[PDB]
Design an enzyme around this catalytic site. Structure first.
Site, short mmCIF file in Angstrom:
data_model
loop_
_atom_site.label_atom_id
_atom_site.label_comp_id
_atom_site.label_asym_id
_atom_site.label_seq_id
_atom_site.Cartn_x
_atom_site.Cartn_y
_atom_site.Cartn_z
CB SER A 185 -0.97 -0.03 1.19
OG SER A 185 -2.05 0.85 0.88
CD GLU A 223 -5.34 -4.46 -3.50
OE1 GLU A 223 -5.43 -4.16 -2.28
OE2 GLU A 223 -4.31 -4.97 -4.00
CG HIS A 255 -5.55 -2.51 0.86
ND1 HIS A 255 -4.78 -2.49 -0.29
CD2 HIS A 255 -5.16 -1.43 1.60
CE1 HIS A 255 -3.97 -1.45 -0.24
NE2 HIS A 255 -4.18 -0.79 0.89
C1 A8B Z 1 -11.81 11.77 11.92
C2 A8B Z 1 -12.57 10.84 11.10
C3 A8B Z 1 -11.95 9.83 10.37
C4 A8B Z 1 -10.51 9.69 10.41
C5 A8B Z 1 -9.75 8.69 9.67
N1 A8B Z 1 -10.40 7.78 8.87
C6 A8B Z 1 -9.63 6.77 8.10
C7 A8B Z 1 -10.58 5.75 7.50
C8 A8B Z 1 -9.98 4.96 6.30
C9 A8B Z 1 -8.79 4.06 6.71
C10 A8B Z 1 -9.09 3.08 7.88
C11 A8B Z 1 -8.24 1.82 7.74
C12 A8B Z 1 -7.44 1.48 8.99
C13 A8B Z 1 -6.00 1.17 8.60
N2 A8B Z 1 -5.66 -0.25 8.74
C14 A8B Z 1 -5.67 -1.19 7.74
C15 A8B Z 1 -4.52 -1.31 6.83
C16 A8B Z 1 -4.53 -2.35 5.82
N3 A8B Z 1 -5.63 -3.18 5.72
C17 A8B Z 1 -6.77 -3.11 6.52
C18 A8B Z 1 -7.84 -4.04 6.28
C19 A8B Z 1 -8.98 -4.00 7.06
C20 A8B Z 1 -9.08 -3.02 8.11
C21 A8B Z 1 -8.05 -2.11 8.35
C22 A8B Z 1 -6.84 -2.10 7.56
C23 A8B Z 1 -3.38 -2.58 4.84
C24 A8B Z 1 -2.04 -1.90 5.28
C25 A8B Z 1 -2.32 -0.44 5.65
C26 A8B Z 1 -3.28 -0.39 6.89
C27 A8B Z 1 -8.30 8.67 9.79
C28 A8B Z 1 -7.63 9.59 10.60
N4 A8B Z 1 -8.33 10.54 11.29
C29 A8B Z 1 -9.75 10.65 11.25
C30 A8B Z 1 -10.41 11.67 11.99
#
Ligand code: A8B
Ligand code: A8B
Ligand code: NAG
Ligand code: NAG
Ligand code: NAG
Ligand code: NAG
Lengths: 528, 528
Positions: A197, A324, A437
């Site tokens: 990623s 993904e 992913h």
């Molecule tokens: C307010 C509201 C929302 C957010 C926010 N929202 C992100 C949501 C979208 C992102 C959330 C995913 C978690 C990462 N963790 C995960 C990662 C990977 N795969 C995953 C698969 C399933 C669940 C989590 C995963 C592959 C490698 C990289 C990391 C982020 C920061 N600050 C905020 C502040």
């Protein structure tokens, strides 16, 4: 002692670790940069001052400051990605797993973690390098780098927060490996950088950047590429997000110096608390602080660099997973939830496409919707859910990687492409999310080799062939031991499926959808 | 005498004709308008002055002046469409086949021939109405109307060449049928107008036009609809083509009167010789002189009329053939030829799409090309040929008919839709052309009933069920005799296949491609 190693920066003392009823040495938490704290926040990293005495490298270092996922408290599916060490701005360390007895000059693999450039840790259980170091006899390194605003706040023109410093953190770690890995038995002329990623996008960024090219030999990119739509922004957009971040913290905005000074007095958590408020659109699969096309780390636009062969020529191995996009919809699109099949209504589908292509006008949204809708069965909830899953994955990962591979292969010295579509027998995530992913990682790092993790015998065999394809390619530039993974060529474009079934070779991975994302849609958005 | 009929316009004497070893009466060449010659060229038709004495209606009338196909001299496939009578501007006649003994008040069917509004004759062997009149006991009428510049030269604002006069010719013939068909045994309250290609578009035009609505009861449209992209032009474009025609004949262009006067002194063949030079683009499936949206025959745009229910509400039966576009590619696109399989190269494909969507910018051409190209097999000659065939048919016939049927069905009183996909065992055209535009006609008119024409027993059975579906629908507003052809509804959108196999019902005829032609592409061309 096997656990004592003298480097150009000082002596370090590792620890012995058990692995599959044997053992290897681990040198955890070796510092490679001065702590980027205080006045150093947002600045380029500085090399670690050599130390006298013995650096204790028997334990994992702190993780860099980042947003922490609390959506499913205690659910291993999501917590396995959260930092598992205390967080600190003092976080620039690297970890090394070394076969026992200490090699003399063997293959080196350097892992760069993903996490959207806003999160990630080198210390996650899924990234434990002991199985790969042990089984394949490689010296495995995992580095770390600043994420979020700490690593990517960009005020182009300022030397105090130039942007891309997180990428410079990665480079510094690679410079350290180049300079010191020989003392741990690694061959610095044979280092493969690999990442998933944002980590795969980073890998591709070092292949591109003149200043990073000489520090590694070969590269592996998993579900990520440098030209991904979420992996970089222009300097004007970076500037605008930096200013908007300061505005969220009531900072004086009259000058860069005023903004930076204000941002430097805030506690880490204050920046993390408003970080997400700077995105320009209601979107999914977009992150606030990411690499900037600055004219320095990236001399010109990524597309012109790819077009002109302006990049490191060597061998690459890379690929994508079948689904993904599913987890980004789970977390940010209406109608998707962890505990239901997530059959999606037509209205949620439409809401889903607007979130997925945040940068599109109405015509563009109609083109995406038409391309992914089965019009003789438009209210099919499963089809709407799956269509949206493919839109997210095709646009954010697959098609940008396919565009990168075709551009790279015209100038490179060998490409191996894969499609990972094995759904793990022990997945804790619901069925609808498919081959998620990040879920090929546990196979690359060999977790299926440990009985207690409950994988099947065939899953263990799959993990062993992937680990061996990865290490053999790292060692030779070819995943095959002298049933063959054929070379991807611009003419044939062959690739293999990576699962528990007999290898199958195919061609033109998602060509149909990718001509849409890579040629038609951008042409359409540029005219209208 | 059975062959003598007195009408409000005078007495007419028909002739007895043999049909399937029996006989019926035919009244051929009955005049329904004054000859539109001399100063009358380009003007609205005038009713035929009643005659004293007995009009000899024992022989076919002359065909209207038109371009004659000489591409395959003596090839029956193409010559069966050419005029088979001498040509003359004196050509406004109608033909009537009447069962024997003379009915009292039976179902009437009025045929309107196709031919792109630039050609066509009511006297073609494929249009011989004796089989249908005989087998179904209907009074069958075929009318004629001026084509080409003679019927559609349009100088809006002028009363000398107002445009649409060919449509007014058709209306006048319908007024004559309304007024006189009772004397031949027809029921004027039960007349069905039916036609193919330009004839089907015409039928739909009378359903729309306030001035024609009251002159018929029900309607059948075969491979044509009023909103077809080639069936009408704006008054400004009609004007521009009229002026450009005059310019080709070295006419004085200072005023309408000067232009019209000059055009009226030219011999018919002079107009036919340069007629094709006025098309605004290098195109396929577009004709020079066609109906004009004048604000009179068509009070407002066809789309707003369809949108508001501004049209005759009654029952309609209509449909399309599987390969509507093949013959236009044979005649006008590079790479297609009569005697080869016509596998098409990628460049000819691209040349083919430019010709097919003459009105499109680059973005539009890319959208069509992407929609019809299989990108994992783009050099497949058969796929390129078939893709282009579908582009022509979908854009010119199928999708415009599907848009008409869905708009009509919201306000109408019953719709029956079919998909004709039987390739005749005795077709003289090559295989690649499939189920050709115009080739369901011979089945509607029952040619498979005559042994010498060499059709199969199942082809004869298919012809008999179509003839009976058509006449039963003409008689009752329902093709079914009290295995069922279901009603097309806006909710289910059901239709049937029409071939030699057991009836199959399907839904949403070419929805996928038609959402592209009817919603996306026009939105795209309008923005870019
Ligand atoms: C307010 C509201 C929302 C957010 C926010 N929202 C992100 C949501 C979208 C992102 C959330 C995913 C978690 C990462 N963790 C995960 C990662 C990977 N795969 C995953 C698969 C399933 C669940 C989590 C995963 C592959 C490698 C990289 C990391 C982020 C920061 N600050 C905020 C502040
Ligand atoms: C110069 C150059 C070209 C032309 C031209 N080029 C027309 C080519 C495109 C049109 C040629 C088709 C022949 C019609 N005849 C046919 C018709 C139908 N089906 C057919 C199927 C196969 C072949 C001919 C058909 C179904 C019913 C309507 C008539 C026309 C006038 N003047 C010109 C002058
Ligand atoms: C190394 O540091 C860790 C810090 O927790 C400590 O537990 C361990 O005992 C130390 N060992 C030595 C030799 O200092
Ligand atoms: C890689 O480079 C070597 C030496 O320059 C060359 O011989 C070989 O053919 C190249 N291989 C590929 C995959 O292009
Ligand atoms: C009817 O007109 C045709 C014209 O060719 C002629 O052959 C036929 O003999 C005529 N019959 C009568 C009764 O005038
Ligand atoms: C047609 O109209 C009649 C009478 O107005 C009505 O009873 C019938 O339901 C209608 N049929 C259709 C197909 O709408």
């Amino acid at each position: 002692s096997e656990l004592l190693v003298n480097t150009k920066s000082g002596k370090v003392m590792g620890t012995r670790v058990p692995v599959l009823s044997s053992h290897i040495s681990a040198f955890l938490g070796i510092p490679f940069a001065e702590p980027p704290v205080g006045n150093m926040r947002f600045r380029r990293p500085e090399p670690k001052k050599p130390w006298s005495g013995v650096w204790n490298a028997s334990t994992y270092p702190n993780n860099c400051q980042q947003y922490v996922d609390e959506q499913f408290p205690g659910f291993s599916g999501s917590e396995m990605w959260n930092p598992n060490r205390e967080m600190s701005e003092d976080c620039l360390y690297l970890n090394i797993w070394v076969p026992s007895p200490r090699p003399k000059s063997t293959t080196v693999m350097v892992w760069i973690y993903g996490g959207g450039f806003y999160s990630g840790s080198s210390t996650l259980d899924v990234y434990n390098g002991k199985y790969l170091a042990y089984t394949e006899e490689v010296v495995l390194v995992s580095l770390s780098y600043r994420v979020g605003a700490f690593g990517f706040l960009a005020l182009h023109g300022s030397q105090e927060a130039p942007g891309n410093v997180g990428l410079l953190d990665q480079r510094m770690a690679l410079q350290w490996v180049h300079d010191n890995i020989q003392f741990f038995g690694g061959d610095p002329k044979t280092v493969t950088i690999f990442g998933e990623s944002a980590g795969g996008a980073s890998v591709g960024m070092h292949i591109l950047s003149p200043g990073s090219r000489d520090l590694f030999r070969r590269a592996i990119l998993q579900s990520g590429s440098p030209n991904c739509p979420w992996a970089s922004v222009s300097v004007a957009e970076g500037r605008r997000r930096a200013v908007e971040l300061g505005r969220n913290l009531n900072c004086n905005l009259n000058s860069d110096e005023e903004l930076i000074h204000c941002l430097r007095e805030k506690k880490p958590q204050e920046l993390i608390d408003v970080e997400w408020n700077v995105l320009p659109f209601d979107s999914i699969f977009r992150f606030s602080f990411v690499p900037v096309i600055d004219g320095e780390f990236f001399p010109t636009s990524l597309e012109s660099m790819l077009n002109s062969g302006n990049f490191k020529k060597t061998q690459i191995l890379l690929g994508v997973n079948k689904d993904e996009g599913s987890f980004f919809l789970l977390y940010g699109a209406p109608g998707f939830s962890k505990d239901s099949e997530s059959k999606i209504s037509r209205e949620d589908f439409m809401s889903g496409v607007k979130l997925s292509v945040p940068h599109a006008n109405d015509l563009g949204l109609d083109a995406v919707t038409l391309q992914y809708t089965d019009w003789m069965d438009d209210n099919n909830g499963i089809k709407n859910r799956d269509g949206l899953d493919d839109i997210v994955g095709d646009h954010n990962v697959i098609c940008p990687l396919m565009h990168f591979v075709n551009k790279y292969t015209k100038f490179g010295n060998g490409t191996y492409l894969y499609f990972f579509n094995h759904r793990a027998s022990n997945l804790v995530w619901p069925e609808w999310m498919g081959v998620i992913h990040g879920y090929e990682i546990e196979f690359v790092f060999g977790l299926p080799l440990v009985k207690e993790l409950n994988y099947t015998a065939e899953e263990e065999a799959l993990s062993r062939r992937i680990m061996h394809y990865w290490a053999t390619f790292a060692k030779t530039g070819n995943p095959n031991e002298p049933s063959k993974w054929p070379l991807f060529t611009t003419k044939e474009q062959k690739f293999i499926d990576l699962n528990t079934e007999p290898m199958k070779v195919h061609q033109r991975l998602r060509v149909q959808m990718c001509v849409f994302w890579n040629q038609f849609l951008p042409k359409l958005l540029n005219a209208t």
